Design a binder for this molecule. Structure first.
Ligand SMILES: O=C(O)[C@H]1O[C@@H](O[C@H]2[C@H](O)[C@H](O)[C@H](O[C@H]3[C@H](O)[C@H](O)[C@@H](O)O[C@@H]3C(=O)O)O[C@@H]2C(=O)O)[C@@H](O)[C@@H](O)[C@@H]1O
Ligand SMILES: O=C(O)[C@H]1O[C@@H](O[C@H]2[C@H](O)[C@H](O)[C@H](O[C@H]3[C@H](O)[C@H](O)[C@H](O)O[C@@H]3C(=O)O)O[C@H]2C(=O)O)[C@@H](O)[C@@H](O)[C@@H]1O
Ligand SMILES: [Cl-]
Length: 232
């Protein structure tokens, strides 16, 4: 039988602050249900150690969405509220099966748009450089479709071993740290000033596959939203 993520202590803090959306943004499991042992092939404990997400289908997801802690409702915060908002993770990205082309593994999202997606990418050129099998950040600085609305950055080549990420937002600026090294340093998020509906996400969100049957798979060794105010 499949082992539940809540059967160990590692992920209990974030599970107390998230709902699971699967296979779309529809509710699969509340925070209470996650803490109570919700499990399926889409969301189970691998190797006694990893919170593993799996999903097939274009634009489908198996993803945690940040909630107010202790049974609360959906959270919404602003890039310019003066608080530092932080998400941390340690992720093992396996080799992806044929047909999977991009898997979003962490986000900042709002009611209307993704401010930030960190994604694995099979193949893409950025600023005239071709990259394969790598982790990318995609930041929106507008809501349009033209390339001027996005800042897309190579973060790191995918590693077999765990890779650490940290996302920080403070005073309308974004920092992304990968394996302890700052890769994105103070990216401007001020376009989003006053949007009070932002939240963190993490898991597997499958983008532009070439086969809707192909199953994306992502293993988390750690995941947390870090509260700089220590509300207790
Ligand atoms: O390599 C490129 O720059 C390609 O960008 C394509 O447009 C992207 C866009 O930059 C961005 O990555 C966007 O991301 C969306 C995501 O895939 C999901 O649909 C959801 O999260 O919404 C995201 C968003 O709207 O920000 O996806 C588009 C896209 O549809 O591919 C094109 O410009 C492409 O021609 C170009 O090669
Ligand atoms: O286009 C998407 O799939 C976006 O969905 C976003 O989640 C929303 C979405 O409305 C979703 O259906 C669900 O809606 C909830 C909503 O949270 C509301 O507050 C209440 O919980 O009932 C609604 C419902 O059950 O329909 O959750 C929403 C949310 O903001 O959490 C995100 O998953 C986006 O990332 C996505 O692009
Ligand atoms: Cl799409």
């Amino acid at each position: 039988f499949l082992t539940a993520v809540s059967s160990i202590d590692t992920f209990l803090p974030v599970l107390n602050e998230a709902k699971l959306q699967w296979p779309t943004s529809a509710l699969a499991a509340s925070s209470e249900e996650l803490l109570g042992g919700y499990v399926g092939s889409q969301f189970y404990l691998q190797d006694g150690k990893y919170m593993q997400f799996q999903i097939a289908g274009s634009s489908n997801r198996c993803e945690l969405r940040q909630m107010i802690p202790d049974g609360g409702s959906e959270i919404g915060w602003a890039v310019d509220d003066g608080t530092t908002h932080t998400a941390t993770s340690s992720i093992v990205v396996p080799e992806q099966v044929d047909g999977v082309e991009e898997v979003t593994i962490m986000q900042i999202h709002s009611g209307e748009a993704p401010q930030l997606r960190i994604s694995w990418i099979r193949s893409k050129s950025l600023d005239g450089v071709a990259y394969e099998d790598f982790i990318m950040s995609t930041v929106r600085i507008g809501t349009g479709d033209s390339s001027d609305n996005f800042v897309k950055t190579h973060l790191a080549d995918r590693t077999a071993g765990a890779m650490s990420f940290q996302i920080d937002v403070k005073d309308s600026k974004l920092t992304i740290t990968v394996n302890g090294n700052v890769v994105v340093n103070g990216q401007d998020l001020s376009f989003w000033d006053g949007t009070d509906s932002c939240y963190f996400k993490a898991g597997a969100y499958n983008n532009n596959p070439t086969s809707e049957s192909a199953t994306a798979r992502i293993k988390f060794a750690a995941l947390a939203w870090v509260d700089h105010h220590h509300h207790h």
